[PDB]
RNA sequence: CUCAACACGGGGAAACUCACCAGGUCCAGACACAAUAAGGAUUGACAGAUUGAGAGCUCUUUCUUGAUUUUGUGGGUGGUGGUG
């Protein structure tokens, strides 16, 4: 304590960003997608959002007891006051961070660019997305850089609904010729949205009326 | 495969397996052409033949500390001098044709 | 009984107001005097970077904001029920401190 | 590195004791915060281990992250200790 | 920057190579068999009678210390 | 270097920043091989000379250190060095 809330709330943010960049670098080979911290009294806890939890949770408790030590050594936590959980991913076909790492590692196995990228867009469409778009930019097959974009569905990128329905991820893939850039935008449809708005702002639905009987039989019914 | 049966199975029939190959005739072999489909249809990340743990460390010295340089060594195997550079300790995906020419040009029998 | 004070600080409006609502709901589940949620003025923390790396282009500026919402509730309670109500309403993004006197 | 032998012992034992070292990318940092030795020694001792195997390093935000591998835990036994001792978080 | 001139006199000079003399640990030996101290020990409590005080010219200098133990005589 | 360079590089530089100039240290050259090497691989130093300098830089002197270093061969690493 003894720190102002202005410096306290900012320091919580930079602590989160340092953790997130650590796990992108460390759990790159396990399909990592994000973290969230739950600052509680008595052992603040950290959850790791990675597809293959059977790999993140190593043999007999290794590979996450190691990461528990690595965090509390670097951030000077007391022992036992931080624990690391790994629940897997909510529908990995719709996360742009996870689908960019999939796009990255498919490129590093020497897959053709047009095949590795059409295999990502069609998987995201299979996952119930309304539109997604993959951009590969760099020196693709020549010495002069170009940019290829692969799209399906539709995407909106205009306003506040971008903050609601767009997930973006940028990845640097390191090649023999140089560096290629991977950009994945995924627009999850608002119909399956659980929280927040559930429709686009200019979408109107009219409740269909039920037709009535004309004469309606002028009379009285009593009790 | 190679003359084990392809003449013995040709006893007055003359057609079993006479179809044409893939058809490059100077582009390299298809030793990973099977694995290229598997990384295409599997919608996750797979690890590409991770590293060269001791075939890097031990065979760099037996090849190059003997007489030679990598600028010389990459010239007789016909690859760029950074290809041998990433076969030195780590940081490569090892393919068969490059690793075969690495073996037959300098003798050390580690694959 | 003892005079207590609970201070809430967060960057999320929706996640904070329901926590204070649970605090007051547990406060008149078993009745005691409220001195209910007094909302402090919101703090806007502004960082104005330029836009870019290197200074080529029109001199365009951005401003980024973090919004700090703060609320304190001044309760009095027996010593037993203090711990349970301070431990049940724990939610991510909301920082709760409890001053003893 | 010259790195006198009584400072390999402090470094190598602590890597055996926990299995992790983080250690603060800053050379000439004057007595690293966990081990009683210099911070330059901690960074350069475990660079020697990494090149031969025995440990894997991650770097992020001016900090290193050292993890003892399974080819290094067996080696670090006869360097410092006797058998049937568990270095890493393998101990339940 | 194209090259270097090195206007300083052409000094690729290096340190003394921790100068390699012959075997030197000798108190003195008499016949059968005793030995007595020469280049006497230090007055340091942390030098437990194992260090040799060099005598350059009117100086007694210890090497267990980094810099300075001066019991001059 | 027209708009789309010229209170712009968040560039209000006393040192630091710092990339430039006159000079002095150090290796922070991992690992592998080979050699030297427990008749010592090597490391550090008081005083004086010397030096901008209380830099053992280097030298005079003779103590200390002990197998991590040194030398050579390949590499490794770093670079506000080049190419936007």
Swiss-Prot record, chain D:
Record localization: Cytoplasm
Keyword Ribosomal protein applies: yes
GO molecular function, one term: RNA binding
BP GO terms, sorted: cellular response to amino acid starvation; cytoplasmic translation; positive regulation of protein kinase activity; ribosomal subunit export from nucleus
Gene Ontology CC terms, in alphabetical order: cytosol; cytosolic small ribosomal subunit
Keyword annotations: Cytoplasm, Ribonucleoprotein, Ribosomal protein
Protein family membership: Belongs to the eukaryotic ribosomal protein eS10 family.
Main function: Component of the ribosome, a large ribonucleoprotein complex responsible for the synthesis of proteins in the cell. The small ribosomal subunit (SSU) binds messenger RNAs (mRNAs) and translates the encoded message by selecting cognate aminoacyl-transfer RNA (tRNA) molecules. The large subunit (LSU) contains the ribosomal catalytic site termed the peptidyl transferase center (PTC), which catalyzes the formation of peptide bonds, thereby polymerizing the amino acids delivered by tRNAs into a polypeptide chain.
Misc. comment: Present with 54100 molecules/cell in log phase SD medium. There are 2 genes for eS10 in yeast.
Subunit structure: Component of the small ribosomal subunit (SSU). Mature yeast ribosomes consist of a small (40S) and a large (60S) subunit. The 40S small subunit contains 1 molecule of ribosomal RNA (18S rRNA) and 33 different proteins (encoded by 57 genes). The large 60S subunit contains 3 rRNA molecules (25S, 5.8S and 5S rRNA) and 46 different proteins (encoded by 81 genes). eS10 interacts with GCN1 (via middle region); this interaction is direct and promotes GCN2 kinase activity.
Protein name: Small ribosomal subunit protein eS10A
Organism lineage string: Eukaryota, Fungi, Dikarya, Ascomycota, Saccharomycotina
